[PDB]
């Protein structure tokens, strides 16, 4: 089942061979709908057998999974799924692949611009796992970095000022590799993630 | 309309004919593909037509390199001019092909680079024949036998192996027979420079 | 003159062991005005030499030395100098480095968001030279190519509609391997500029 999750993003990608390309019509029997689908057919299993899950390996595999199947599906796609989705979907933050990384920090950008109740509940749970990716780390690329960064204001723009008050300093500080990395985007967009936080808690 | 390599005097003098071949454009009309050669009854711009031909070929070209504005000027109005109907036989765009070729090898200044760029470029979409037989031709055949060669346009100014590449991919984007006898001949070096060379950055880029 | 353009970043960089920093009083001759000094003791010479020079090596000098001072200069610090830098500021959006990449692209931010003039009368030459920054090549790094897309964005967003509606397709067609490459944030992004390029071009 390991490999079966680590493999599973095979259902869902792009072909760049067969599709209905301009021009060519007998190309194949081409679906659009393969991707929601697939997904509308695989989440919901796998969210229930993650919830009915205890040891490293199986929820592990679960995560794998549904974070493989949810990468390449576009996010703002899949809106039913996005509520049973919350808890896979804050635990696909921390795993080697910087690919399940992007996937799930735009899922939980797209979420917390249409969800609020779950994220205004799970601000306290999100915060340091974003201060962690945003760590420079073995799995964290700058990219990776900058996505936490981004994520970091989302949350904070969506998240009322009460608890934005209390996630200020942290990420003030854990910060410091990060608008001082290899790269200067990630720089330049540390430095600007490091003053509005600055100036929302200010205000 | 007086001969003059100067700086303000030649620009605007060029910028003066900008506004000629507009009149001249409105008052008869412009290119097609099958008016290339045609020209129209009668004006006083025929009997100036040497005029202003020698004065742009001495502001594109016989000009100094750090010129930006007025060989940009220049090759605008080299495109221009040839956007009449038939009214510059074939010869005259042979010449004006050659001069944005060479002072596009010659000069890095990526003003006068894309500059010349667009002007082959419309050079390319208003005349098949005239563009692949001058300007696409040269430039494969300034690539040597063997890869990783400084491409030596004149006795200093070189380019490098892959700016022939590069130029290759700016036009013959819509220009059926250079886009073929393009696709051709770098089958061929590809081919070349597999057999009789041992390269494998240059058959990547040529594929 | 090549060699000591290629080192001459080293006059402005940070320091990290030597400044002015909190706690220790004895630490140096510290002064913090060096990078802004510096910068309108160099450009203006640099951009006079650039403008009154010929051929490829001491023009390379000067845009190199010219760049590797404005990438550690804050670009937003140094205004005055902007108007004379446009033109080396153009010239500098082609080169291996990515760290001049990145510093050229967020001048360009920074001017097309203070000066509208500039980018008014060279948007026609800007805008393929950011479609070549946006194609994959060995010197495009994924993240020159987000940042490509970032000022596309910028200068299509200050740029009028006249202008902008004229490069609309180029911009479409051009980012196939930016929406599709190794990073997600980087296609996720592309997919984000594609769409509001469409967008905006339609309307």
Redesign the interface.
Known sequence: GSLVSKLFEVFVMDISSLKKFKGISWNNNVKILYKQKFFGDIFQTLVSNYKNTVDMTIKCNYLTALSLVLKHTPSQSVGPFINDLFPLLLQALDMPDPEVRVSALETLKDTTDKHHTLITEHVSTIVPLLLSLSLPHKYNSVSVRLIALQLLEMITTVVPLNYCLSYQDDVLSALIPVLSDKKRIIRKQCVDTRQVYYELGQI | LINTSEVAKLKLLIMNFSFFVDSYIDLFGRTSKESLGTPVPNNKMAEYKDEIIMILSMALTRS???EVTIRTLSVIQFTKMIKMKGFLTPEEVSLIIQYFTEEILTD?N??IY?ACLEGLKTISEIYEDLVFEISLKKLLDLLPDCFEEKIRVNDE?NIHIETILKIILDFTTSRHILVKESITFLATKLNRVAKISKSREYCFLLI
């Open positions: 100094s390199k750090a890095n990526k003003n894309y100014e």
